[PDB]
Assembly symmetry: C3
Homo-oligomer: 104 residues x 3
């Protein structure tokens, strides 16, 4: 199995989820802060440049079978794409083992 981790623009989430549901995929979502090319505003306070604005991102973590992860990566990438800065990244990690807690 593969854990597909997508850091995306928050307003893209439901388009990504519709793309996932289209492929027969449940997922787990987190709110995170993004640092990268696109920057927020800062302010100097006591020898440090403090971030005064921040760039919310949505992290989608979804476990999938090896036989669908490539299709899932492309669907997320196409559903999350705008062509503008701050689009984000997809990281695929291998799952050594997965368990369904409800049944075992």
């Amino acid at each position: 199995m593969k854990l597909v981790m997508a850091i995306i623009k928050p307003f893209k989430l439901d388009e990504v989820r519709e793309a996932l549901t289209s492929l027969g995929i449940g997922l787990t979502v987190s709110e995170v802060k993004g640092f990268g090319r696109q920057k927020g505003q800062t302010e100097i306070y006591r020898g440090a440049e403090y971030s005064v604005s921040f760039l919310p991102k949505v992290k989608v973590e979804v476990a999938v079978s090896d036989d669908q992860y490539e299709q899932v990566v492309e669907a997320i990438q196409k559903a999350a794409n705008t062509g503008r800065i701050g689009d984000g990244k997809i990281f695929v990690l291998d799952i050594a083992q997965a368990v369904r807690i409800r049944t075992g």
Copy 2:
């Protein structure tokens, strides 16, 4: 080493932690939003079905040695289990390398 990631019902956390402490395991906990078979309420607003309720989950991330990860997976699964919908998932990922920041 293995990174064990458990998405569980929030009210199960302290039972899972007691199960971990029983096996000699520190852990890191996140609040996440769950999508899956169990669904929340939605509402139509401007060409989109907006989620008006959500399903909080607790994400437990705990790094363990290979010689205890199987026991850890089963303990979390048994401590997190209710037999009801929304129980969640456990994903085990391989750790290429781990570092204790305090000592190096």
Copy 3:
């Protein structure tokens, strides 16, 4: 590629980020709750010991090339280090595949 996951003291974040920027590294940050040797206060309420204080941590997740991950691990470890309890951990995970959403 490698996904470097660092659980650190929140007040260390900007020092870690400066250490990352020094090496030519964007990153994704989460707020998490820490359990470990350093403990918070609890209170007995209805057959359970409830946590009344908690230990905020910052989770840094940064994807890097294999040819810089060791340097990145050490830079984070040195920038996040205080020598005091609660310093945290670094877990390195292998990335099977990464995608830039903006371009594909």
